[PDB]
Amino acid sequence: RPRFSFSIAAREGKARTGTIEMKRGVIRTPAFMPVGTAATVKALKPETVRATGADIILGNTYHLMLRPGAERIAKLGGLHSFMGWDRPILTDSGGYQVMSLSSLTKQSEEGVTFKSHLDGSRHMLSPERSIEIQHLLGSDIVMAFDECTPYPATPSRAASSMERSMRWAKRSRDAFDSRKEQAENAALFGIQQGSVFENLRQQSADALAEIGFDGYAVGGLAVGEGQDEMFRVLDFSVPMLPDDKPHYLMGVGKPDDIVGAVERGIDMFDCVLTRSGRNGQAFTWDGPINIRNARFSEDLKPLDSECHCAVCQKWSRAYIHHLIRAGEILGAMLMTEHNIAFYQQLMQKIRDSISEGRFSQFAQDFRARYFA
């Protein structure tokens, strides 16, 4: 098996379907990656994650470096061994969660120092340390460490963080290449920045292509801009990236965001789905429902009428309504398994429709029903 081979089997418009072959397995694209936070995909055994159809999961570097610790995971044999998932794992860089979750952050050209949200202990990330942590975890796809740009951003601030991010992309590339075992067995993705600005997006794409990566994320989106703007930025941004490498839209998203992003050339996705009753949200082909709603208390139908998942085979809305209202762990288990299965079924339908040259029709039909 190669370290990394992305092959495009079929195209329709800007959409593509294909495979990434890696040492630990094949990833079918477009792909949805369930998110493992602290070395677990919430409420699911790895076998259950695989049973939903997932080919790859995401691990959060920030959480892992705090608990149990990167060096500790390495001592124990790496993240795959530790958590019992033997297929590919993509790790993020840790940078975003430092900005969103940690306190007392000091930022400079060298990286960021910060206080853990768990115990106030002091930590550091930098391009070099982020790549090192991802090496210690043993992940298969490594994300370059960048500097996030908040939305909204002025052109000056967006340029500055894009420029810094490109300097850090080169540092990430060299750090990754400096470690033989990592360079030979893992892949490295760069992240395009530039906020909503076409010229900065172009400069960033050119800088990243000059350095050269195995894949390219469109960074800096899904941070408050809303779908119309996100799509507008994707419209000009994705074509700037190398066509022959995967395009990853980090942290996206709701089913309709995924479909529209695939229409715009995105191949990979991840997101986590719980505040204010939101743990009760279940995806259906007729749109989301909140299973906590009293209207489900006696509803004997499955979460979704067509879903092939094990939860829909075995349990009713009424039961899952009860479990979630009662705060039972099994409620979280069942809801998560169904929702991730639903996402994987969505991705399968997207892949099949692109392969069959009927993705535009699929997208129209999907929207007409999902938003009816």
Sign of CA dihedral 2, 31, 252, 248: positive
338 has binding-site annotation: yes
Closest by CA position to 341, among listed 48, 80, 18: 48
Residue found under tokens 């979460």: 303
Considering the rule CB under 5 A, would residue 16 count as an interface residue with Zn ion?
A: no
Annotation marks residue 228 as catalytic: no
Angle, CA 277 vertex, CA 275 and CA 282 arms, to 5°: 105
Choose between 34 and 190: whose C-beta lies nearer to a copy of itself. 34
Breaks after residues in the chain, judged by C–N over 2.5 Å = 273
Choose between 14 and 45: whose C-beta lies nearer to a copy of itself. 45
Residues in CB range of 275: below 8 A, 6 or more apart? none
The interface partner of residue 141, options being a copy of itself, Zn ion, none and the CB cut-off 5 to 8 Å by kind, is none
220 has binding-site annotation: yes
Considering the rule CB under 5 A, would residue 144 count as an interface residue with Zn ion?
A: no
The type of residue at 158 is A
Considering the rule CB under 5 A, would residue 317 count as an interface residue with Zn ion?
A: no
Which is the catalytic residue, given 55, 267, 270, 304?
A: 270
The interface partner of residue 329, options being a copy of itself, Zn ion, none and the CB cut-off 5 to 8 Å by kind, is a copy of itself
Annotation marks residue 206 as catalytic: no
Angle, CA 292 vertex, CA 309 and CA 60 arms, to 5°: 60
Q: Quick one: 37 exposed, middle or buried, by C-beta within 10 A (0-12, 13-18, 19+)? A: middle
299 has binding-site annotation: no
Tokens representing 269 are 């996705």
Q: Coil, helix or strand for 304?
A: coil
Which is the catalytic residue, given 55, 92, 214, 304?
A: 92
- Binding-site ranges for a copy of itself (CB under 8 A): 38-40, 42-45, 67-68, 72, 75-77, 82-84, 297-298, 300, 314-316, 318-319, 322-323, 325-326, 328-330, 332-333
The interface partner of residue 307, options being Zn ion, a copy of itself, none and the CB cut-off 5 to 8 Å by kind, is Zn ion
148 has binding-site annotation: no
The interface partner of residue 312, options being a copy of itself, Zn ion, none and the CB cut-off 5 to 8 Å by kind, is Zn ion
309 has binding-site annotation: yes
Tokens representing 44 are 């699911």
CA–CA gap between residue 44 and residue 38 (Å, rounded): 13
Enumerate residues 270-309 that contact Zn ion by CB under 5 A.
307, 309
The interface partner of residue 314, options being Zn ion, a copy of itself, none and the CB cut-off 5 to 8 Å by kind, is a copy of itself
**Secondary structure string (H, E, C) spanning 261-284:** HHHCCCCEEECCCCHHHHHHEECC
CA–CA gap between residue 107 and residue 110 (Å, rounded): 8
- Binding-site members are 92-96, 146, 193, 220, 307, 309, 312, 338
Active site positions, annotated: 92, 270
Bind-site residues for Zn(2+): 307, 309, 312, 338
Positions that interact with Zn ion (CB under 5 A): 307, 309, 311-312, 338
